[PDB]
Design a protein. Structure first.
Lengths: 114, 87
């Protein structure tokens, strides 16, 4: 896991927002189990995964090439796949790289010496 | 009839003078009910809502104004007598 993507909390809030439905083991999510634990949905409304009463299988979210991917285990026929990206304002990561080189300073007279 | 408490229990009755905007039918076999989760007030039908769609309204009152309030209440920006902010 790379410290350039996003904090973990923002990711989980995004995925919980994308289920449009609650999670029983939401507060049970930890740092060790990221994709190994299938997610149980308290199917208290029609699904948004395929507009079905309830899935007979759980949903598993997977990570690859800098993105969490969510989908259904088993038969992904009457379903679809959603992909969510992780890049915390790449311009901020760039700008934080440039300061690591120590190649722009600030001076008491008030202007930056590059 | 609606109050603050009666949130995720009471049904909401709709007299469909026109077709339902939720599912484009003449009327509904059952009323609709409201739920609160992750800052959203979900709209759904009571029963088997396969021919229905869940709508959500988010409750986030200008996230940036909340952050402004928090930074302000931390007491780190002050307006001085000369018109200069000091941080």
């Amino acid at each position: 896991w790379e410290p350039g993507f996003i904090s973990f909390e923002d990711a989980i809030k995004r995925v919980s927002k994308i289920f449009i439905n609650s999670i029983i083991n939401f507060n049970d999510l930890d740092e060790n189990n990221f994709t190994t634990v299938p997610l149980v949905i308290d199917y208290v409304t029609p699904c948004a995964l395929c507009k079905k009463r309830s899935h007979k299988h759980p949903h598993q979210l997977s990570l690859e090439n800098g993105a969490i991917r969510i989908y259904k285990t088993g038969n992904p026929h009457s379903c679809k796949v959603k992909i969510v990206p992780l890049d915390g304002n790449k311009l901020f990561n760039i700008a934080q790289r440039i300061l690591d080189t120590n190649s722009v300073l600030l001076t008491e007279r008030g202007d930056h010496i590059v």
